[PDB]
Structure formats: structure tokens, C-alpha cells
Coordinates of N, CA and C and ligand atoms in Angstrom, one line a residue:
Chain G
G1 N 4.2 -79.9 -140.8 CA 3.8 -80.0 -141.4 C 2.4 -80.3 -141.3
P2 N 0.6 -79.5 -141.9 CA -0.3 -80.4 -141.4 C -0.2 -81.6 -142.5
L3 N -1.2 -82.3 -142.3 CA -1.9 -83.9 -142.9 C -3.2 -84.3 -142.2
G4 N -3.5 -84.9 -143.3 CA -4.6 -85.2 -143.6 C -5.8 -84.3 -144.4
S5 N -6.0 -83.9 -144.8 CA -6.6 -82.8 -145.7 C -6.1 -83.4 -146.5
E6 N -5.7 -83.8 -147.7 CA -5.4 -84.2 -148.9 C -4.9 -85.3 -149.0
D7 N -4.1 -85.6 -148.0 CA -3.0 -86.8 -148.1 C -2.9 -87.3 -146.4
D8 N -2.1 -88.8 -146.1 CA -1.8 -88.5 -144.3 C -1.4 -90.3 -144.5
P9 N -0.9 -90.6 -143.8 CA 0.1 -92.4 -143.7 C -1.2 -92.7 -143.0
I10 N -1.8 -94.2 -142.6 CA -2.0 -94.6 -141.8 C -1.2 -94.2 -140.2
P11 N -1.6 -93.9 -139.6 CA -0.3 -94.1 -138.2 C -0.4 -95.9 -137.9
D12 N 0.7 -96.6 -137.0 CA 0.7 -98.0 -136.5 C 0.2 -98.3 -135.4
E13 N -1.1 -97.0 -135.0 CA -1.7 -97.2 -133.8 C -2.7 -97.6 -134.1
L14 N -3.1 -97.8 -135.8 CA -4.7 -97.9 -136.2 C -4.9 -98.4 -137.1
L15 N -4.2 -99.2 -137.5 CA -3.0 -100.0 -138.9 C -2.3 -100.8 -139.5
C16 N -3.2 -102.0 -139.4 CA -2.9 -103.2 -139.0 C -1.9 -103.7 -140.3
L17 N -1.3 -104.5 -139.5 CA -0.3 -104.3 -140.2 C 0.6 -105.7 -141.2
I18 N -1.0 -106.7 -140.7 CA -0.5 -107.6 -142.1 C -1.1 -107.6 -143.6
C19 N -2.1 -106.5 -143.8 CA -2.5 -106.1 -145.0 C -2.0 -104.3 -144.1
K20 N -1.0 -103.9 -144.0 CA -0.6 -102.4 -144.3 C -1.0 -101.4 -144.2
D21 N -2.8 -101.7 -143.8 CA -3.6 -100.6 -144.2 C -4.8 -100.7 -142.9
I22 N -6.1 -99.7 -142.6 CA -6.3 -99.7 -141.6 C -7.5 -100.9 -141.7
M23 N -7.9 -101.1 -140.3 CA -8.8 -102.1 -140.0 C -10.3 -101.2 -138.8
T24 N -10.9 -101.7 -139.1 CA -11.9 -101.7 -138.8 C -12.8 -103.1 -137.7
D25 N -13.4 -102.8 -136.5 CA -13.9 -103.9 -135.5 C -12.2 -104.3 -135.3
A26 N -11.1 -103.9 -135.0 CA -9.6 -104.6 -134.9 C -9.7 -105.8 -133.7
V27 N -8.9 -106.3 -133.3 CA -9.2 -107.1 -132.4 C -7.1 -107.3 -131.9
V28 N -6.9 -107.3 -130.4 CA -6.0 -107.5 -129.5 C -5.1 -109.2 -129.8
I29 N -3.8 -108.9 -129.8 CA -3.4 -110.9 -129.5 C -2.7 -110.6 -128.2
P30 N -3.5 -111.6 -127.5 CA -2.3 -111.5 -126.4 C -1.1 -112.2 -126.3
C31 N -0.4 -112.4 -127.3 CA 1.1 -113.5 -127.5 C 1.9 -111.8 -127.5
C32 N 1.3 -110.6 -128.2 CA 2.7 -109.6 -128.3 C 1.8 -108.5 -127.5
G33 N 0.4 -107.9 -128.0 CA -0.3 -107.0 -128.2 C -0.7 -106.0 -129.4
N34 N -0.4 -106.5 -130.5 CA -0.4 -105.7 -131.6 C -1.6 -106.2 -132.1
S35 N -2.4 -104.8 -133.1 CA -3.7 -105.3 -132.5 C -3.5 -105.6 -135.2
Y36 N -4.7 -106.6 -135.2 CA -4.6 -106.3 -136.6 C -6.8 -106.9 -137.1
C37 N -6.5 -106.9 -137.9 CA -7.8 -106.6 -138.4 C -8.5 -108.4 -138.0
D38 N -9.3 -108.9 -137.9 CA -10.2 -110.1 -137.0 C -10.0 -111.2 -137.8
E39 N -9.9 -111.0 -138.9 CA -9.8 -111.5 -140.4 C -8.3 -111.8 -140.6
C40 N -7.4 -110.8 -140.6 CA -6.0 -110.6 -141.3 C -5.6 -111.7 -139.9
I41 N -5.5 -111.4 -138.7 CA -4.7 -112.8 -137.6 C -5.3 -113.4 -138.2
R42 N -6.6 -113.7 -137.8 CA -7.1 -114.9 -138.2 C -6.4 -115.9 -139.4
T43 N -6.3 -115.8 -140.5 CA -5.3 -115.7 -141.3 C -3.8 -116.5 -141.2
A44 N -3.3 -115.9 -140.5 CA -2.4 -115.9 -139.7 C -2.0 -116.8 -139.2
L45 N -2.9 -117.2 -138.1 CA -2.9 -118.7 -137.3 C -3.5 -118.9 -138.0
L46 N -4.6 -119.8 -138.6 CA -5.5 -120.6 -139.5 C -4.0 -121.0 -140.2
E47 N -3.3 -120.5 -141.0 CA -2.7 -121.1 -142.5 C -1.2 -121.3 -141.2
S48 N -0.7 -121.0 -140.2 CA 0.0 -121.5 -139.3 C 0.5 -122.2 -138.6
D49 N 0.3 -124.0 -138.9 CA 0.3 -125.0 -137.3 C 0.7 -124.6 -136.5
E50 N 1.8 -123.6 -135.6 CA 3.0 -123.5 -135.0 C 1.8 -121.9 -134.5
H51 N 1.2 -121.8 -134.9 CA 0.6 -120.2 -135.0 C 1.1 -119.2 -134.8
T52 N 2.4 -119.7 -135.4 CA 3.5 -118.7 -135.9 C 2.6 -116.4 -135.6
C53 N 2.7 -115.8 -134.2 CA 2.3 -114.7 -135.3 C 2.9 -114.1 -135.7
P54 N 2.1 -113.2 -136.9 CA 2.6 -112.5 -137.5 C 3.0 -111.1 -137.6
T55 N 3.7 -111.1 -136.3 CA 4.0 -109.4 -135.7 C 5.9 -109.8 -135.0
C56 N 5.4 -110.9 -134.1 CA 6.0 -111.3 -133.1 C 6.8 -113.2 -132.9
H57 N 6.2 -113.3 -133.8 CA 6.4 -114.8 -134.6 C 6.7 -115.8 -133.4
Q58 N 5.2 -115.8 -132.9 CA 4.5 -116.4 -131.2 C 4.7 -117.5 -132.1
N59 N 4.9 -118.9 -131.2 CA 4.3 -120.1 -131.3 C 3.1 -120.6 -130.7
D60 N 2.8 -119.7 -130.0 CA 1.4 -120.6 -128.7 C 0.3 -119.2 -128.3
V61 N 0.4 -119.1 -129.9 CA -1.7 -118.0 -129.6 C -2.5 -118.5 -130.2
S62 N -3.8 -118.0 -130.2 CA -4.8 -118.6 -131.0 C -5.8 -117.5 -131.7
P63 N -6.6 -117.9 -132.8 CA -7.9 -117.1 -132.6 C -9.0 -116.9 -131.9
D64 N -8.8 -117.8 -131.4 CA -10.4 -117.8 -130.0 C -9.2 -117.1 -129.2
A65 N -8.3 -116.5 -128.6 CA -7.5 -116.1 -127.9 C -8.0 -114.5 -127.3
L66 N -8.4 -114.0 -129.2 CA -8.5 -112.4 -129.6 C -9.2 -111.8 -128.7
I67 N -9.1 -110.8 -128.6 CA -9.5 -110.3 -127.0 C -10.3 -108.3 -128.5
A68 N -10.8 -108.2 -127.6 CA -11.7 -107.2 -128.6 C -11.1 -105.3 -127.8
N69 N -10.1 -104.1 -128.7 CA -9.7 -104.0 -128.4 C -10.3 -102.9 -128.7
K70 N -11.0 -101.9 -127.8 CA -12.3 -100.9 -128.0 C -11.5 -100.0 -128.3
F71 N -10.4 -99.7 -127.6 CA -9.9 -98.3 -128.1 C -9.3 -98.7 -130.0
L72 N -8.8 -99.4 -130.2 CA -8.5 -99.7 -131.3 C -9.0 -99.2 -132.4
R73 N -10.8 -99.3 -131.7 CA -11.4 -99.4 -133.3 C -12.3 -98.5 -133.0
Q74 N -12.2 -96.9 -132.1 CA -12.9 -96.4 -131.4 C -11.5 -95.0 -132.2
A75 N -10.3 -95.4 -132.4 CA -9.2 -94.5 -132.7 C -9.7 -95.3 -134.6
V76 N -9.5 -95.8 -134.9 CA -10.1 -96.1 -136.3 C -11.3 -95.2 -136.7
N77 N -12.1 -95.6 -136.1 CA -13.3 -94.6 -136.5 C -13.3 -92.7 -136.4
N78 N -12.6 -92.8 -135.6 CA -12.4 -91.1 -135.3 C -11.4 -90.7 -136.8
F79 N -10.1 -92.3 -136.7 CA -9.3 -91.0 -137.8 C -10.0 -91.3 -139.2
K80 N -10.7 -92.1 -139.6 CA -11.6 -92.6 -141.0 C -12.6 -90.8 -141.0
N81 N -13.5 -90.7 -139.8 CA -13.6 -89.7 -140.2 C -13.0 -88.0 -140.0
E82 N -11.5 -88.3 -139.5 CA -11.0 -86.8 -139.7 C -10.7 -86.4 -141.0
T83 N -10.2 -87.0 -141.3 CA -9.4 -87.2 -142.7 C -9.8 -88.5 -144.0
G84 N -11.3 -88.5 -143.9 CA -12.2 -89.4 -144.7 C -12.0 -90.6 -145.1
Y85 N -11.2 -90.7 -144.4 CA -11.0 -92.3 -145.4 C -11.9 -93.1 -145.4
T86 N -11.9 -94.1 -147.1 CA -12.8 -94.5 -147.3 C -12.4 -94.9 -148.5
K87 N -12.8 -95.9 -149.7 CA -12.6 -96.5 -150.7 C -14.1 -96.7 -151.4
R88 N -13.4 -96.7 -152.4 CA -14.4 -97.3 -153.7 C -15.5 -98.6 -153.7
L89 N -16.2 -98.6 -153.6 CA -16.6 -100.2 -153.9 C -17.1 -100.6 -155.3
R90 N -17.0 -101.8 -155.2 CA -17.6 -102.1 -156.8 C -18.2 -103.5 -156.8
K91 N -19.0 -103.0 -157.8 CA -20.3 -104.4 -157.9 C -19.5 -105.5 -158.4
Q92 N -18.6 -106.1 -157.3 CA -18.6 -107.3 -158.1 C -18.8 -108.5 -157.3
Chain P
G1 N -18.3 -76.7 -133.6 CA -16.9 -76.0 -133.7 C -15.2 -77.5 -134.3
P2 N -14.7 -76.5 -134.6 CA -13.2 -76.8 -133.9 C -13.0 -77.3 -132.9
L3 N -12.2 -78.3 -132.5 CA -11.4 -78.9 -130.8 C -9.6 -78.6 -131.6
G4 N -9.3 -78.2 -129.8 CA -7.8 -78.7 -130.4 C -7.3 -76.9 -130.4
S5 N -8.4 -76.2 -130.5 CA -7.9 -75.0 -129.9 C -7.6 -74.4 -128.5
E6 N -8.0 -74.1 -127.4 CA -7.3 -74.1 -126.3 C -8.4 -75.0 -125.4
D7 N -8.6 -75.9 -125.8 CA -9.9 -77.3 -124.8 C -10.1 -78.1 -126.0
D8 N -9.7 -79.9 -125.1 CA -9.8 -81.1 -126.1 C -10.1 -82.0 -125.1
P9 N -11.0 -82.4 -124.8 CA -11.0 -83.7 -123.7 C -10.4 -85.2 -124.3
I10 N -9.6 -85.7 -123.5 CA -9.0 -87.0 -123.9 C -9.9 -88.1 -124.5
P11 N -9.6 -89.1 -125.3 CA -11.0 -90.2 -125.7 C -10.9 -91.3 -125.2
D12 N -12.0 -91.9 -125.1 CA -11.2 -93.3 -125.1 C -11.1 -94.5 -125.5
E13 N -10.6 -94.1 -127.2 CA -9.3 -94.9 -127.7 C -8.0 -94.6 -127.0
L14 N -8.0 -93.8 -125.8 CA -6.7 -93.6 -125.1 C -6.2 -93.1 -123.8
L15 N -8.0 -93.3 -123.3 CA -8.0 -92.8 -122.3 C -8.4 -93.5 -121.0
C16 N -7.6 -93.7 -119.8 CA -7.7 -94.8 -118.8 C -9.3 -94.5 -118.0
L17 N -9.8 -95.7 -117.6 CA -11.3 -95.6 -117.5 C -11.1 -94.9 -115.9
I18 N -10.2 -96.3 -115.5 CA -9.7 -95.9 -114.3 C -9.6 -94.7 -113.5
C19 N -8.6 -94.3 -113.9 CA -8.5 -92.6 -113.4 C -8.6 -91.5 -114.6
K20 N -9.7 -92.4 -116.0 CA -11.2 -90.9 -116.4 C -9.5 -90.5 -116.9
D21 N -8.0 -90.2 -117.2 CA -7.0 -89.8 -118.3 C -6.2 -90.4 -118.5
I22 N -5.7 -90.1 -120.2 CA -4.7 -90.7 -120.3 C -3.6 -91.2 -119.4
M23 N -2.9 -92.0 -120.2 CA -1.6 -93.1 -119.2 C -0.8 -92.9 -120.8
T24 N 0.8 -93.3 -120.4 CA 1.3 -94.1 -121.1 C 2.0 -95.5 -121.1
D25 N 2.6 -96.2 -121.8 CA 3.0 -97.2 -121.9 C 1.8 -98.3 -121.3
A26 N 0.2 -97.6 -122.1 CA -0.5 -98.6 -121.7 C -0.4 -100.0 -122.2
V27 N -1.4 -100.8 -121.4 CA -1.8 -102.2 -121.3 C -2.7 -102.2 -121.2
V28 N -2.6 -103.5 -121.7 CA -4.5 -104.7 -123.0 C -4.8 -105.3 -121.4
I29 N -5.6 -105.4 -121.3 CA -6.3 -107.0 -120.5 C -7.4 -107.6 -121.5
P30 N -6.6 -108.9 -121.5 CA -7.1 -110.6 -121.8 C -8.8 -110.7 -121.5
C31 N -9.2 -109.7 -120.6 CA -11.0 -110.2 -120.4 C -11.5 -109.6 -121.4
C32 N -11.3 -108.2 -121.6 CA -13.0 -107.6 -122.0 C -11.8 -107.0 -123.5
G33 N -10.2 -106.8 -123.1 CA -10.3 -105.8 -124.5 C -9.1 -104.1 -123.8
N34 N -10.2 -103.8 -122.7 CA -10.2 -102.2 -122.5 C -8.6 -102.6 -121.8
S35 N -7.9 -100.9 -122.2 CA -6.9 -100.5 -121.7 C -6.7 -99.8 -121.1
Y36 N -5.9 -99.9 -120.2 CA -5.0 -98.7 -118.7 C -4.1 -98.9 -118.5
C37 N -3.5 -97.7 -117.5 CA -2.5 -97.3 -117.0 C -1.9 -98.8 -116.2
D38 N -0.9 -99.3 -117.0 CA -0.5 -100.2 -116.0 C -0.2 -100.6 -114.6
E39 N -0.2 -99.3 -114.0 CA -0.6 -99.2 -112.7 C -1.8 -99.3 -112.0
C40 N -2.6 -99.0 -113.3 CA -4.2 -98.7 -112.5 C -4.7 -100.0 -113.0
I41 N -4.4 -100.6 -113.3 CA -5.6 -102.1 -114.2 C -4.4 -102.6 -113.3
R42 N -3.4 -103.0 -112.5 CA -2.7 -103.8 -111.7 C -3.6 -103.4 -110.7
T43 N -3.9 -102.1 -110.0 CA -4.0 -101.7 -108.7 C -5.7 -102.8 -108.9
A44 N -6.4 -102.6 -109.9 CA -7.4 -103.1 -109.4 C -7.4 -104.1 -109.0
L45 N -6.7 -106.0 -110.1 CA -6.8 -106.7 -109.9 C -5.9 -107.6 -108.0
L46 N -5.7 -106.1 -108.0 CA -4.5 -106.5 -106.9 C -5.6 -106.4 -105.7
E47 N -6.3 -105.5 -105.4 CA -7.4 -105.2 -104.7 C -8.8 -106.0 -104.8
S48 N -8.6 -106.7 -105.8 CA -10.4 -107.6 -105.7 C -9.8 -108.9 -105.8
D49 N -10.1 -109.9 -104.8 CA -9.6 -110.7 -104.7 C -10.0 -111.8 -106.0
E50 N -11.6 -111.6 -106.4 CA -11.9 -111.9 -107.3 C -11.7 -112.1 -109.0
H51 N -10.4 -111.1 -109.2 CA -10.0 -110.5 -110.0 C -10.9 -109.4 -111.0
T52 N -12.0 -109.0 -110.4 CA -12.8 -108.1 -110.7 C -12.5 -106.9 -111.2
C53 N -12.7 -107.3 -113.0 CA -12.1 -106.4 -114.4 C -12.7 -105.0 -113.7
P54 N -12.4 -103.9 -113.6 CA -12.6 -102.9 -113.3 C -13.5 -101.2 -114.6
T55 N -13.7 -102.7 -115.2 CA -14.5 -102.5 -116.7 C -15.5 -103.4 -117.1
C56 N -15.6 -104.2 -117.5 CA -16.7 -105.3 -117.5 C -16.8 -106.2 -115.9
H57 N -15.6 -105.8 -114.9 CA -16.1 -107.1 -113.8 C -15.5 -108.3 -113.9
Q58 N -15.1 -108.7 -114.7 CA -15.0 -110.4 -115.1 C -13.9 -110.8 -113.7
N59 N -14.2 -111.9 -113.3 CA -13.9 -112.7 -112.0 C -12.4 -113.7 -112.2
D60 N -11.2 -113.7 -114.0 CA -10.6 -114.4 -114.1 C -9.2 -113.7 -114.9
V61 N -9.4 -112.7 -114.1 CA -8.5 -111.7 -115.0 C -7.0 -112.3 -114.3
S62 N -5.8 -111.2 -114.3 CA -4.5 -111.8 -113.9 C -3.7 -109.9 -114.4
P63 N -3.0 -109.4 -113.0 CA -2.1 -107.8 -113.3 C -0.7 -109.1 -114.6
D64 N -0.5 -109.8 -114.2 CA 0.6 -111.0 -115.5 C 0.2 -111.3 -116.5
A65 N -1.1 -111.5 -116.9 CA -2.2 -111.6 -118.5 C -2.0 -110.2 -118.9
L66 N -1.7 -108.9 -118.5 CA -1.8 -108.2 -118.8 C -0.9 -107.9 -120.0
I67 N -1.0 -107.5 -121.3 CA -0.6 -107.1 -122.5 C 0.2 -106.2 -123.3
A68 N 0.9 -105.9 -124.2 CA 1.0 -104.7 -124.6 C 0.8 -104.3 -125.9
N69 N -0.6 -102.8 -125.3 CA -0.8 -102.5 -126.7 C -0.5 -101.4 -127.0
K70 N 0.4 -102.1 -128.4 CA 1.2 -100.9 -129.4 C 1.0 -99.9 -129.0
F71 N 0.3 -100.3 -130.1 CA -0.5 -98.8 -130.5 C -1.4 -98.0 -130.1
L72 N -1.7 -98.4 -128.9 CA -2.7 -98.0 -127.6 C -1.0 -97.1 -127.5
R73 N -0.4 -96.9 -126.7 CA 0.7 -96.3 -126.3 C 1.4 -95.0 -127.9
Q74 N 1.1 -96.0 -128.9 CA 1.7 -95.0 -130.0 C 0.6 -94.0 -130.2
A75 N -0.8 -94.3 -130.4 CA -2.5 -93.1 -130.0 C -1.5 -92.1 -129.0
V76 N -1.1 -92.5 -128.0 CA -1.0 -91.7 -126.7 C -0.2 -90.2 -126.9
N77 N 1.1 -90.8 -127.0 CA 1.9 -90.5 -127.9 C 1.7 -89.4 -128.8
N78 N 0.9 -89.9 -129.8 CA 0.9 -89.2 -131.2 C 0.3 -87.7 -130.8
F79 N -0.8 -88.2 -129.6 CA -1.7 -87.3 -129.2 C -1.9 -86.5 -128.1
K80 N -0.7 -87.1 -127.2 CA -0.4 -85.8 -126.7 C 0.6 -84.5 -127.3
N81 N 1.1 -85.1 -127.9 CA 2.3 -83.7 -129.2 C 1.1 -83.4 -129.6
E82 N -0.2 -83.2 -130.1 CA -1.5 -82.9 -131.2 C -1.3 -81.8 -130.2
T83 N -1.9 -81.2 -129.0 CA -2.9 -80.9 -128.6 C -1.9 -80.1 -127.4
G84 N -0.5 -81.3 -126.9 CA 0.4 -80.6 -126.0 C 0.0 -81.0 -124.5
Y85 N -0.7 -81.9 -124.7 CA -0.9 -82.1 -123.3 C 0.6 -83.1 -122.8
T86 N 0.8 -82.8 -121.3 CA 1.6 -83.2 -120.2 C 1.7 -82.3 -119.4
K87 N 2.6 -83.2 -118.4 CA 2.0 -82.4 -116.8 C 3.6 -81.8 -115.7
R88 N 3.9 -81.7 -115.0 CA 4.8 -81.6 -114.0 C 5.0 -83.6 -113.8
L89 N 5.8 -83.3 -114.6 CA 7.2 -85.0 -113.7 C 8.3 -84.6 -112.8
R90 N 8.9 -85.1 -112.0 CA 9.4 -85.5 -111.5 C 11.1 -86.3 -111.1
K91 N 12.2 -85.7 -111.0 CA 13.2 -87.1 -110.5 C 13.5 -87.4 -109.8
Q92 N 12.9 -87.8 -109.3 CA 12.8 -88.8 -108.2 C 14.1 -89.4 -108.6
Ligands
ZN101 ZN1 2.3 -111.7 -131.0
ZN102 ZN1 -5.4 -106.2 -142.1
ZN103 ZN1 -12.1 -106.6 -118.3
ZN104 ZN1 -5.5 -95.3 -115.2

């Protein structure tokens, strides 16, 4: 049936595994190929001295080796506009 | 108007720039981040001794450094099933 009208789950083709949610300005990891939030993937490598990838569990990656997944960022932007994905910010 | 009725173009978020068409099992280039057909991107580096990227015109890439854009391949698979994009395959 149809999805996206009032409900729809974010696909893994544009959803960060680290926070299990969509990301903006997503990057790619040259250790495996998965894409996540720039900050999310950075945190994984920063907190892991072994540079343990948060998906393939690699031990030779780097937050400086993060490439720009143009396609990812594009899809996310379109997806957000189709289903109208967004959230309510606060005055924190 | 809407898209998907009887005509729909392939977006740059899952469309290969090299052949200007969708691809399957797309890979990513760690030089810039763009994704293209494994065969297409391979050909670009294979024919260019300078390893001139077919998008950013880099000079230090490689067909071996091609990573697996999990997300790309997933998007392509879904997109193909949405519009019904496909072609004549052969059992060679
Ligand atoms: Zn990895
Ligand atoms: Zn994230
Ligand atoms: Zn490039
Ligand atoms: Zn191609």
C-alpha cells in the first residue's frame, strides 16, 4: 500500500545507522561504504582509539577520511520534501 | 504536476553521471564522494593514467579504492520498483 502520506519509515538508503534516524549532509566511510551523520560517524571514531567502525567494526578508518556522499545528501533532501520529514525544535 | 504517471527522470542521487543513467551495485569514489557504475568509474580511471576523476577531475584515485555505497544500491533498488525502471537483460 501507500506510504509517506502520514506515516513512513526512513529507509537504510538515507538513514543513519548510528542514531537510527535520517541525517543531513551525510558522509561516506571508505572502510566499508556506509553513510552516517558527519558528527555521528566522527563520534564513533573519536571514542574508539582502534577506529572501530560502527557498522563493519573496522580498525583502520578515520574521521578525516570521510568523503562527501553527494547522492546521499540529495536523496535525504528529496525524501524530506516528499513525506515532509522534520521535527519540532525548542527554545533550549 | 506529479511525477511517476508515465514519465519520470532518474535523480542524481542514484543516477550515474558517467553514463547519465541509473546503475546497480553502485560504488563510491573516495576522491570526491560521487557514485557511479563499478564498470563506468573503473573505465574512467583505467583510461586516464592521471587517474582523472570523471566528475571532480582528481589525479590520485584508483579503481581499487572504490568503496561500496550500500545506501546508493538500496535507493536504486527501491526507485526501480517505484517507477518500474528496467531493461532487457541477457542470460549470457
Ligand atoms: Zn566501516
Ligand atoms: Zn547519525
Ligand atoms: Zn572524484
Ligand atoms: Zn554508469
